[PDB]
Amino acid sequence: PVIKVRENEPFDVALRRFKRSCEKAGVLAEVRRREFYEKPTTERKRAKASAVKRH
Amino acid sequence: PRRRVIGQRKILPDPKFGSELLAKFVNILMVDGKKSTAESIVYSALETLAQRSGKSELEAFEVALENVRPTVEVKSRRVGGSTYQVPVEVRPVRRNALAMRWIVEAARKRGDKSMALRLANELSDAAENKGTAVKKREDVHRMAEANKAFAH
Amino acid sequence: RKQVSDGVAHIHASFNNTIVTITDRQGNALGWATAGGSGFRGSRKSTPFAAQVAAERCADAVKEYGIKNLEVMVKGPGPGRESTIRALNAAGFRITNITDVTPIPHXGCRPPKKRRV
RNA sequence: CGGCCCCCUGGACGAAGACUGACGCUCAGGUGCGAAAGCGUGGGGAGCAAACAGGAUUAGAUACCCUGGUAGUCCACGCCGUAAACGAUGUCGACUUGGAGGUUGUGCCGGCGUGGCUUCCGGAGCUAACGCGUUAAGUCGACCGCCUGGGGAGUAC
RNA sequence: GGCCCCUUAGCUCAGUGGUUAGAGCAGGCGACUCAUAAUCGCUUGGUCGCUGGUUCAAGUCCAGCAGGGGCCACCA
Numbered sequence: 174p175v176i177k178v179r180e181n182e183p184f185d186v187a188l189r190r191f192k193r194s195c196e197k198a199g200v201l202a203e204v205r206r207r208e209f210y211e212k213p214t215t216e217r218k219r220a221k222a223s224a225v226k227r228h
Numbered sequence: 229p230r231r232r233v234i235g236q237r238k239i240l241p242d243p244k245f246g247s248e249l250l251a252k253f254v255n256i257l258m259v260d261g262k263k264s265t266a267e268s269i270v271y272s273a274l275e276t277l278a279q280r281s282g283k284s285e286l287e288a289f290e291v292a293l294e295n296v297r298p299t300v301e302v303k304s305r306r307v308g309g310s311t312y313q314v315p316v317e318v319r320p321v322r323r324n325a326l327a328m329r330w331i332v333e334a335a336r337k338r339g340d341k342s343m344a345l346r347l348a349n350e351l352s353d354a355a356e357n358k359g360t361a362v363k364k365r366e367d368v369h370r371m372a373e374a375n376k377a378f379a380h
Numbered sequence: 381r382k383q384v385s386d387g388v389a390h391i392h393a394s395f396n397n398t399i400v401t402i403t404d405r406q407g408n409a410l411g412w413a414t415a416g417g418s419g420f421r422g423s424r425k426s427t428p429f430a431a432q433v434a435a436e437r438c439a440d441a442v443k444e445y446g447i448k449n450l451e452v453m454v455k456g457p458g459p460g461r462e463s464t465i466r467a468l469n470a471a472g473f474r475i476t477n478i479t480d481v482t483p484i485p486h487x488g489c490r491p492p493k494k495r496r497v
Numbered sequence: 498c499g500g501c502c503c504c505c506u507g508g509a510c511g512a513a514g515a516c517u518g519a520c521g522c523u524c525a526g527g528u529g530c531g532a533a534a535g536c537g538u539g540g541g542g543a544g545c546a547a548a549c550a551g552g553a554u555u556a557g558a559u560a561c562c563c564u565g566g567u568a569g570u571c572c573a574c575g576c577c578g579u580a581a582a583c584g585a586u587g588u589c590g591a592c593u594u595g596g597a598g599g600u601u602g603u604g605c606c607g608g609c610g611u612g613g614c615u616u617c618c619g620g621a622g623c624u625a626a627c628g629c630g631u632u633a634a635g636u637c638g639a640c641c642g643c644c645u646g647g648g649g650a651g652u653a654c
Numbered sequence: 655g656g657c658c659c660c661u662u663a664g665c666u667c668a669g670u671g672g673u674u675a676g677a678g679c680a681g682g683c684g685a686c687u688c689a690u691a692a693u694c695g696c697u698u699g700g701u702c703g704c705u706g707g708u709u710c711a712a713g714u715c716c717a718g719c720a721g722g723g724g725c726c727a728c729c730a
């Protein structure tokens with residue numbers, strides 16, 4: 174997320190644009206997902222459980 | 229309570245000054261329901277302070293009261309099951325009540341011969357930043373300042 | 381001594397601590413400060429207030445270099461991800477870029493086992 | 498069974514036509530393949546981590562948490578032959594109302610059809626019940642494997 | 655035998671001849687929790703060994719001993 178501040182704009186707008194770029198980029202989700210190790214069976218079960226609950 | 233039903237109860241200003249604040253202070257100083265013995269002490273202390281300072285009779289009390297009123301206190305709040313010390317604001321009525329109570333308790337612990345003289349000394353010191361109520365207010369302020377990171 | 385007027389501020393955000401360091405554009409550090417050394421230990425060390433204080437106290441030690449402009453690049457998911465740059469704004473520094481530099485394996489190694497708390 | 502490219506190689510499906518003429522189904526003994534951990538000989542070793550050492554928590558803590566860390570995890574060849582190896586549902590064939598999707602072929606003019614595989618709901622019927630329901634646990638045929646109260650015991654010789 | 659390190663709260667470490675005796679370390683009282691454990695706030699405190707020196711000005715500079723300390727040296 175390279176956020177280049179442009180001419181004649183305050184700090185708040187650039188800050189909000191950077192925050193939205195990071196939120197849409199999904200960096201925090203990846204960093205959380207890589208904190209520990211997940212056995213293949215555990216993830217295969219959790220994905221199906223989430224899919225069943227959603228539908 | 230669980231219901232939010234309670235309200236405010238009317239109070240009569242004191243006769244010779246028409247001030248609700250003096251009424252509340254007298255109530256705080258009253259014991260055993262013997263009110264008539266309370267305003268006597270209050271009046272004696274007020275007149276002794278008035279003659280000692282020479283500024284006024286009612287403005288000295290107001291200045292001493294203002295010198296002690298705090299603006300922040302510490303309570304407990306939780307987010308994930310662990311208790312904290314969080315600083316919170318104080319409403320004006322609570323400020324006045326705390327100031328009066330601190331002044332009374334500070335006055336009650338001395339070695340003079342009369343209670344009115346103790347009151348005179350304590351109001352004087354509060355007006356000139358030497359009473360123990362000043363120490364109470366400062367300690368509360370600094371404990372609130374120490375636990376500043378937890379302020380949501 | 382020396383005059384630069386153009387620097388870059390690197391932020392290391394972590395669940396336990398935050399580190400702020402200002403360096404020249406060729407990666408030659410001029411100063412740094414941490415929330416841990418700023419008088420905060422234990423639980424308070426992991427709050428955005430600590431990151432704000434650390435950022436301001438670090439900027440307080442780069443005034444002699446006469447820095448006029450800064451850009452910020454930040455890594456880590458910690459809670460100091462936000463208040464640090466606002467505290468830098470309150471120091472009057474010019475802000476030109478805000479960038480994310482958090483590392484990401486494209487597979488990589490194997491993470492440690494989950495804690496059974 | 499998962500980054501990208503090349504070489505060798507097994508199966509499945511659809512479309513019209515031709516050819517052989519029952520050459521079929523199932524299968525006791527027999528043969529082959531078969532997760533991970535483990536074993537033998539020779540390599541390699543970033544990260545992780547049985548055993549092991551220290552720090553805590555605790556009445557105790559040979560643990561759960563933290564700091565370290567060796568076999569092992571990786572490669573070539575050779576053994577081992579076991580899993581909640583599960584759809585807890587043997588293989589082959591025929592017949593029996595519907596609705597909503599997914600993936601991949603083909604014919605005629607976005608429309609009208611026609612095959613293969615696959616996900617969810619549900620009718621008759623079945624079932625002790627839960628439930629299954631054209632991918633049956635529904636109605637029949639051919640062959641194989643297995644069961645006969647709980648422990649002792651999938652143990653002893 | 656010769657050079658050289660210093661002597662300070664209940665304890666350990668700091669302290670420039672002027673207008674400092676400095677912090678940490680145990681305890682006491684409060685703060686939070688229904689209440690401990692962990693956290694936070696305020697504090698009970700000092701003979702600069704004895705003595706002397708020059709010096710307006712000395713814990714401060716010099717030491718005499720003593721105490722606790724190294725090396726140099728060693729053919730009654």
Ligand SMILES: [Mg+2]
Nearest residue numbers: 496497561562
């Ligand atoms: Mg537990």
Ligand SMILES: [Mg+2]
Nearest residue numbers: 524525526527
């Ligand atoms: Mg057989």
Ligand SMILES: [Mg+2]
Nearest residue numbers: 533534535570
């Ligand atoms: Mg293996």
Ligand SMILES: [Mg+2]
Nearest residue numbers: 534535536569
């Ligand atoms: Mg092995």
Ligand SMILES: [Mg+2]
Nearest residue numbers: 535536537569
């Ligand atoms: Mg091996």
Ligand SMILES: [Mg+2]
Nearest residue numbers: 539540541568
């Ligand atoms: Mg080996």
Ligand SMILES: [Mg+2]
Nearest residue numbers: 492545546566
């Ligand atoms: Mg490890």
Ligand SMILES: [Mg+2]
Nearest residue numbers: 546563564565
């Ligand atoms: Mg471990």
Ligand SMILES: [Mg+2]
Nearest residue numbers: 535547568569
């Ligand atoms: Mg092993």
Ligand SMILES: [Mg+2]
Nearest residue numbers: 578579580582
């Ligand atoms: Mg078996």
Ligand SMILES: [Mg+2]
Nearest residue numbers: 532580582583
């Ligand atoms: Mg399996």
Ligand SMILES: [Mg+2]
Nearest residue numbers: 581582583585
């Ligand atoms: Mg079985």
Ligand SMILES: [Mg+2]
Nearest residue numbers: 586587588642
């Ligand atoms: Mg079978």
Ligand SMILES: [Mg+2]
Nearest residue numbers: 618619629630
């Ligand atoms: Mg159904």
Ligand SMILES: [Mg+2]
Nearest residue numbers: 644645646647
């Ligand atoms: Mg039976």
Ligand SMILES: [Mg+2]
Nearest residue numbers: 645646647648
């Ligand atoms: Mg039996």
